[PDB]
Each structure stands twice: as C-alpha cells, then as structure tokens.
C-alpha cells in the first residue's frame, strides 16, 4: 500500500492544503506551529478504513481514529462577539492498494453530525475483509502477503512499563495489526513476545537434543524460531552496531530475566541501563521488525527486507547526537527497503543526507492557506551550515553582543575603507572580544591583503 | 544590479496587443491571462537580452532548473496602461508555471513586490546608474554603498527589502561565489597566471548570449582588472 | 547552597572521576553513553540528605534516591567471558551550605549491603531540620531564606494556598527531586491565579484585602518578568496574561500585532515557557518576604538533562542566556549535545567527558574557543564531527577534485569518473559544475 497525495480542507490548522509524497522517504519541516503533527494525524486518519476491515476498530474505544468535532476549524474575530466553525472538514487521499490498483478516497465531517465516508472508502474496507478471508483459508497452496501500517508518536517512550505464538494461523497473523495506529508505547508487547520466542527456542532446542527422533517435525519448529530471531537481530544491528558498537539484542535469564545487549569492550549490559538514544532507537526498530515478522511468517529471513507498507515517525532523531543524526535515514532505508517512510525533523544533520525532492517545507498565511514546497537549493551532501541558512533560514553566526560590531566592521572593510583609525580601533576591539582566530576576522584580513595587493 | 540595455522593439503580437491599452486592473488581468499563447517569444527575447541572468538577483535559473517568468517592472495593477509596453517587461527567476512562490520568494515573486511599489524610491535594472547603489560583502549580504547621500541610502535599503534580496538562499549562493573568487585569486597568484585571459571567461559573453552568474560580485572583486577587461572587449 | 567539586568511585560507568563545577552555569558535553546522566544522578544523590530533613520528604522512601546494586561498576573479562562486579560505590561532594559554611560529605554502598552515609552527611540533615524548625516561627522578625533544589530530567513531560505560613512555604519542596513540567498543569494553575486576581481587582472598581491580594500580585509580576527574559528579545512578545474576552485563553502582547494566544505555538516553546514559569513559581512560594524580587534573589541548584529538547535551532541559541538573566543567583548544571547551545558560552563553562580503555574518566575544558563561534566550527572542533556528511560518492568527489587540481583532466580515467559522477549525482551538482569551470579555466592558456 502506498499514498501519493493528500489534500486537507478545514482541518485543524489548515484552511486548505495539498501535499505530495516521495515514494521511499519524505521529510516534513516546519518552523512555526503544529503543521507537521496535523499532517501526520490526517494521514493516520485516512489509513484507518483499511484496518477497520480486520476487526481492528474502536473496540478499545479509540476516539482519536476518526474526525472529531475538536478537529474542525474555529475562527476568532476580535471585532465580533460570535465564533463559528468551518464546515465541512475533509481529508482526501490518492494512492495504490495493490499492484496496478490506483484509488482515491475521501472522509468528511459536517458540524456535529457523525463522520461520513464515500464509496471508495468502503471499498478500502472490503479489500481488508477479503484479505482477511484469504488469510483464514489456510488450506491453500497460494500465499497471500499482508502490508504494514504503523504510527510512532512522541509518546512512544513515556510509560514503557505498563501492560503468545508464531505460526501460519489467522489469529497469529492478524496480531500484527493490534494497536498498530495507537498513540501510546508498545514496548511490553514486544518484550513479552520476544521473551516467549527466546524461551521456546531454547526449550525446543534441548528437547530436540535429548530426543532427535522428531527431526522432521520438531526440527523445523526450531528453525523457524531461529530465523525469526535472526531477522529481528539483523534489523536492529543495521541501526545500532556501526555508530554505537552495541549489537545482538537477546533475552537473558541469568541477568534477572532481562533484555541485554553486547559490546566488544563493555560486555553484556541490560537495555534499561543504556543511554536514552539507544533505548529509543531499539524500540523504534523493534516495533517495525516484529510486526513484519508476525504479519508474514512465510518469509523466514527476509520478512523485514521484503515487506511493504507505510510508517509514520514524529521526531525521528530524538535523543540522537549529530554523528548518529547523519546516518539514521540510510540505516532505516537499509533495514526496511520496501517500506514508505514519512518522518518529521528539525535537524540540519538529517536534512543534509537526503535529496531536495524528499523535503517538504510547510508554511501558512494569515488566512490559513497552507503550502508544502521544496527547497530552492541543493541539500544532498552539503555542509550543515549551508542547509541551516538556505533551508531553515537561520544564520550560523549567533547573536552575541559583538555580532552587530562584526557586521559593521565587515561592511567597512569590504568597501575599501580599512586604513581609517576608526576601522582599526574596531578591528582591535573585536580581536580582543572574539579572538584573532575567528573565521570572519581571518577572511577580513585576507580581504584587506587582497585589496592592498590590487592597488599596484 | 546590472543595467539592461534594450535593443529590440519586440514582437508583432505584443505590438498589436498594445494598440488598445488596458485601463483597469480587471481588463489587464483578463488580457494577460488570454495572452498566454505568445508569451514564449517575448520571454525568449527578454532572456537573450539579459544574457540569461535574473533581472534582480543575477542568477542562472537555467543552470539550476528554476525557470523564468515575465515580470512587470511597474505593477500592472498600479498602472495597467503599460501591461503590453515592452519597455516595462523583464525576466525574473522562479517561473510562474514544489519550490515556488511563498514567504521566502525573491525577485518578482517576493512578498513586498507583490503588494505595492513606490517608484520614487525603487532602484531597478532599467536605471542607467543603478550599479553604484549597491555593494556585495564577504559574508553573502548586499548593502547600500558608502558613497551615497542620506537620501540615496534610504532608496537602496527600501529596494533591498522590497525584493527580499537578503534571503538565506541568496546569501549562501553569494558567499560560495565569494569563496570561489578567493580560490581563483590565490591560484593565479601562485601559478604566475595572467589575470585577463581567465577573466574573459567570466566577463565576456558567448555567441549564445550567456554570462556567468553574479556579474557584479566578480566585477567588484577585481577592482581595476575587471574594468580593463570590460573596456577592452566592450 | 553551592556544590564546587564531585568525586565518583566505581559508579555506573566510571572507575573514577573528579569534576569541578562553575559558579553560575556548567554544561556537560559528550556523545551518547558517555556519562552525563551518571553525573547528574550522582549530584542528585549528594543533595538528598538535605531534602530528607523536611517532612515534605521525610516520608520519601523512593529507591531511586539511594545507591542501588545496579549502580556498581561491571568489568568485562574477555578471557573468562564474564561480568565482574566492583565494590564499593562512593560519592564525595564538596561545597557551601550557608554563607561561610564549607563542608565535604560522602556516601558509599558495599556489595549487596544497604547504603551507608558518613558523619558529615548527617549534619546536612540536621541543618535541614533546623531550617524547618526556624520556618515554624510566629513572632520572629528575622527573615529565613530557603534555597531552591530542583531536578528536571528527560521524563519531565510524561505526566494552591500562596500564604505566608510554614505549610505554604515548605510546599515549594514538593517533588522537587523528581519534578515535572508540562504546559497543561501550568496553564491550569496560572489561570486559577489570574482568576483570583481579577476577582479582587474588580471588587475595587465596584466599591472604591491585604496579604492575600499582594501575594497574588507579586507572584504574577515575578513570573511575567521571568518569561519576559525569555521571549521579549527574539520576538516582541511580553506580559503573558489570562483573558476571558479572548475566549478564556492565555495570551501575549506584541506592540505591532496586538494579542496572540499561547496555544497557537509549537510544543517546544510552550514547554520552555512552562519550565521557566514553574521555576519562578517555586521561587515565589519558597521566599515570600522577597515580594516581586523572589526570582531575582533566590539561591540554589537546578539540574537539567537535555536542556534543548524539542527546540528549534533558533531557540537553542537563546536559552542559556535567558536562564542566566532570569535567575542570576542560581547555579545551573545542564547537559546537551547541540552545537547551537555551545556557540554562545565561554569555554570555562564547558566540560567534555571522556574515558580510557580501563574506565578512568576525565572532564576537561575545551582547548579552543567557542564564544560567538559559527556552529560548523564548534561541530568540527569541540565534537569532532565533520560538518559535511559522508554520502556514498564523497570519496569519488574528493578523488576527482584532487585529480583535476593537479592537472590531469585529459586522461581517460578522469573523464570516465566524471561521466559516472554526472550520471549518479546529476549535471547540476554544484561541485561538478565547479570542476567543469576549473577545467575550462585551465585551457586557453
Ligand atoms: N553498572 C554498570 N557498569 C558498567 N557500565 C554501566 C553500568 N550501568 C550503566 N553502564 C553504562 O553506562 C552508560 C550509560 O551512560 P549515560 O546513560 O549516563 O550516558 P549519556 O548518553 O551521556 O546520557 P543520557 O543519554 O541519559 O543523557 C552506558 O554505556 C551503560 O552501558
């Protein structure tokens, strides 16, 4: 499944907006307001009719997975006592469901009336229901492959501490959609499933060792367990190993029944005792990896490498340092190379690692009209300061007390008047205030030397 | 900026369209909308006469894949009688029709230039002595020239702010150009090269009517050598 | 209350460390896994004996406020492929409790035994208890000053009386070592305060009081001043208020734009406002006798982990100076990995944390300068990170640049590499265009 375009009308922040998406990776950037969160929420709302067809609906009473009266647009006017709503609110999505199956579907809400959807939005539920039907007829030789939907918000690490099988069964396969668009943390689901997986692998290994007469039947259960473990570990290594050195997430009973990681010089340490960035990244990658494993068991090792779907990440680079921020996007594109990523960030280090066609700068005007444009200049492989000034509009020189004097000195020196006593006094004052090795002062000295050389 | 010299009357369609000038905003808008068929020839002539440089920023929009659009020096909503006057038309970057018009737009698409213009204070490329109003700094900025009256400086700053010529993108590009010029200076000093053979590549046009971008920065960087090159071959 | 030096022995990841702190602001800088949170936690543990002297925390049996078995250091024996625990874990602190009272105290835990404090660490509890006793004085005409203790971690987003009495005064130490600050609660209690003030203010217009009214006015003045120190320079916003006319919302004022609601801003800036306001309100509660100068004259220690969370690079450059201007008498200890934050402080206020193969730690001043320095220079020098990312074709571009520089553009291999790079990066790549201009330049000669 893939989404190519989205249009909003009278939604939370935008009076109207049209945004297209790149095929593999799209990055949203916004200096002011909460436009990025609005776009992510709109995409999440447009993706729900599919999940509705798998019995995965508001059975836990998730009221956030539909347009609410709190999502409509209210205009406050200072000269009037009355405040009205803007109706209807609409979300239109264009994209592809299966190979060659293009579609456009719309959701709308009018005032306080219940939300309504058109006929293509209902066909999107019918497609999920027929996928479920094909999954439940397991007495077949053909294989059906399920897509992936996932949402990872900023509250994915808040209360990690609050809260099994692996086979080709409908109950086991459809557990990969459980809480897949939820706004809360999903870490204990993974921890329990991974613990069961490791314990079953070990117990079946010893059972096979003590009586291998079941080689042809129980010897392929342990192989499936091993392949699942390997897929998950490879996906996690692709993100952690090179930058941090930690690798091979495991479950250990001798460490107080905890998940542990290994380091060449630091040995084995529980994950809960590691740094914030490492825990955040491990949770992020594990989510996607085991959902992929559970959805598509018949792809033993390539479950993560051969699965298709859409993943939404808010603040992809949380708690990561600049050296780690220069490698996150490529690591994600290497671990899951068939998935469509839509992420948000405000880091120039991340932005320098993508082409300008994968970036969307969001802006509004006074009346709510929205725009999602591309950068005017190149960003792929450029220095961080170039991206920071050209794209985000921030001067790399900070506004310290001496900045204005530096600007005046530059303006005087570059325009030929550098032998005047006032200019020299300013030069010496700035040299003592900022040091003689400041790059701008050095280039001003170069300019003075060049101007002296020309006059000859 | 750079002074643009016009030496072409225009096109037959443009001349005929100017026989009955529009006399209000609505007529000007409607007729400009209907004129879309013959815009290509006018734009081709305008771009050729400018040596492929933006009328306000001196960039090579073709080499960056940003395009051009026809700009009215004086807004046609202000004085619609000149909607088809060839003397009131230039070519600006950022063709009209995802990176497009917005808050950070510069040139004809800048926010201020779209609303209102005060022609008394506006310094543009069709004024013979515009180049002496501006100076280009080593950090990417553009400032009014020191040898300007207390009245000319206000006009220069007003023009700089109206066209949004100090955006981060333009500042970065101008800074990179300055760095490259420094590299070239050091190179010719080291290699014992001549500082006129190389400059003819940058300051002298080509048979296909093309100039290197940021003409003014290059001319101001090489104070007297650039003038010698220009006088020799122009 | 001021801490000058800290020493750790066999703590989480440090075999040994000794770190000295600046009087007003200290920033710990390092990559992930270096030990910034370790130092902040050691400092937070060294301060708990004082908080334990008040009844607001004499009941606090939290196990995170003592040395645990998980805090002792583990060594990896590769030949034996095992983890060995090293004991004991020690924390030693030095500093000033009151004017002219220098002290050194220590805490230690050995193996699985309970943690144990030394003789001088009990005197800190005794001093806290004496302060609590002095607060509960009725006719006293000599003022009592209370210091501010506060810890704001990475989980500070997960989740009144205002009298002049002992209960209200000591309510300022409520969950101070595990404090939380998100904008929902801040909006709630600020709105309550403003509603009460508006009631008492209208009552004067109707029929043209005392302690409860002035205590409400002074708190609002102090909090507004503190937030002004944060927002009024980057933008024109000032004087955050509650307005019923503007549909019962919190609003700010701009000389050119009028009133704007606070709820139309980004989460990062709202959380920054909430943090500053919470610090100011705690300062006001602790020391009533300072009236509207409570935030400008209170002393204490504030610890902040990841001081620049969810902040745009424009607000990362004006956060340390805002804190220094709002609370000039407080000692700040913050952590970050952002270079925009570091480009605005002197090198005397920065500590870089490093280790060796055996676990010996160091916390040193940067060698180069950082004040008023471009972000790329700080990134390269302080952090050692090249501002230019290592994309796939970076090595090829460098090799082509080197080849063209030395004058070998006419060889077939150079042309083949140029064509490959053109098809990969494209024909409008700035570096390729620069190389082509260079090639053309070194012709015609
Ligand atoms: N008992 C222990 N023995 C040895 N190493 C330990 C122990 N406990 C934790 N560590 C290591 O200490 C490091 C944790 O450091 P810490 O989390 O403070 O660093 P940080 O990234 O600077 O901080 P933060 O991200 O929380 O701001 C990790 O390498 C962890 O493996």
From TrEMBL, chain B:
InterPro entries: HNH78-like. It comes from the Bacteria. This is TIGR02646 family protein. It comes from Escherichia coli. The lineage of its organism: Bacteria, Pseudomonadati, Pseudomonadota, Gammaproteobacteria, Enterobacterales.
């Amino acid at each position: 499944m893939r989404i190519d375009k989205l249009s909003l009308l009278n939604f939370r922040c935008f009076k109207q907006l049209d945004i297209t998406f790149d095929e593999h990776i799209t990055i949203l950037v916004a200096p002011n307001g909460a436009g990025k969160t609005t776009v992510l929420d709109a995409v999440r709302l447009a993706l729900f009719p599919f999940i509705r067809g798998f019995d995965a609906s508001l059975y836990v009473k998730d009221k956030s997975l539909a347009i609410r009266t709190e999502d409509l647009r209210l205009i406050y006017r200072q000269e009037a006592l009355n405040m009205e709503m803007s109706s209807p609110a609409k979300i239109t999505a264009t994209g592809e469901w299966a190979s060659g199956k293009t579609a456009t579907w719309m959701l709308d809400k009018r005032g306080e009336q219940p939300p309504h959807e058109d006929k293509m939005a209902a066909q999107l539920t019918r497609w999920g229901e027929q996928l479920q039907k094909r999954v439940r007829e397991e007495h077949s030789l053909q294989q059906v492959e399920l897509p992936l939907m996932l949402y990872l918000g900023t509250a994915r690490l808040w209360y990690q501490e609050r809260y099994q099988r692996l086979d080709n069964s409908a109950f086991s396969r459809l557990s990969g959609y459980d809480d897949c668009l939820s706004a809360t943390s999903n870490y204990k689901q993974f921890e329990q499933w991974y613990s069961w997986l490791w314990l079953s692998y070990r117990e079946h290994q010893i059972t096979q060792l003590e009586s291998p007469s079941a080689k042809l039947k129980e010897g392929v259960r342990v192989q499936r367990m091993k392949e699942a473990i390997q897929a998950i570990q490879q996906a996690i290594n692709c993100l952690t190993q090179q930058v941090t050195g930690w690798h091979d997430l495991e479950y250990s009973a001798s460490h107080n029944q905890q998940l542990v990681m290994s380091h060449p010089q630091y040995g084995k340490i529980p994950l809960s005792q590691l740094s914030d960035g490492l825990r955040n990244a491990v949770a992020m990658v594990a989510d996607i990896a085991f959902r992929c494993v559970k959805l598509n068991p018949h792809l033993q090792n390539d479950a993560a490498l051969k699965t298709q779907g859409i993943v939404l990440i808010d603040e992809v680079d949380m708690f990561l340092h600049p050296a780690w921020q220069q490698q996150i996007i490529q690591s994600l594109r290497s671990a899951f190379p068939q998935i469509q990523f839509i992420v948000t960030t405000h880091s120039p280090q991340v932005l320098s690692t993508v082409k300008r066609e994968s970036i969307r700068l969001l802006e509004q005007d006074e009346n709510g009209n929205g725009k999602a444009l591309m950068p005017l200049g190149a960003t792929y492989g450029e220095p961080s300061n170039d991206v920071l000034q050209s794209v985000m509009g921030v001067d790399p020189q900070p506004a310290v007390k001496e900045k204005a004097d530096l600007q005046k000195l530059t303006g005087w020196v570059d325009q030929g008047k550098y032998d005047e006593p006032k200019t020299q006094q300013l030069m010496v004052a700035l040299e003592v205030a900022l040091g003689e090795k400041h790059p701008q002062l050095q280039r001003l000295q170069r300019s003075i030397a060049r101007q002296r050389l020309l006059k000859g | 900026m750079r002074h643009v010299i016009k030496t072409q009357l225009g096109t037959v369609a443009l001349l005929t369209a100017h026989e009955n000038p529009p006399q209000d905003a609505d007529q000007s808008t409607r007729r400009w909308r209907n004129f879309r068929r013959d815009k290509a020839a006018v734009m081709v002539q305008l771009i050729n006469e400018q040596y492929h440089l933006c009328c306000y920023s001196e960039i090579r929009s073709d080499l960056r894949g940003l395009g051009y659009h026809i700009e009215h020096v004086e807004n046609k909503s202000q004085h619609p009688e000149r909607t088809f006057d060839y003397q009131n038309l230039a070519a600006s970057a950022l063709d009209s029709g995802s990176s497009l018009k917005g808050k950070n737009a510069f040139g004809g698409h800048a926010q201020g230039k779209q609303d209102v213009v005060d022609m008394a204070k506006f310094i543009h490329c069709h004024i013979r002595d515009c180049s002496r109003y501006f100076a280009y700094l080593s950090d990417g900025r553009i400032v009014p020239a020191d040898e300007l009256n207390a009245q000319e400086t206000e006009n220069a700053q007003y023009t700089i702010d109206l066209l949004n010529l100090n955006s981060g993108f333009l500042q970065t590009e101008r800074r990179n150009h300055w760095e490259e010029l420094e590299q070239l200076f050091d190179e010719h000093i080291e290699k014992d090269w001549d500082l006129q053979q190389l400059l003819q590549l940058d300051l002298v046009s080509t048979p296909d009517h093309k100039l290197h971008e940021f003409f003014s920065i290059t001319r101001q960087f090489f104070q007297q050598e650039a003038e010698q090159v220009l006088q020799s071959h122009a």
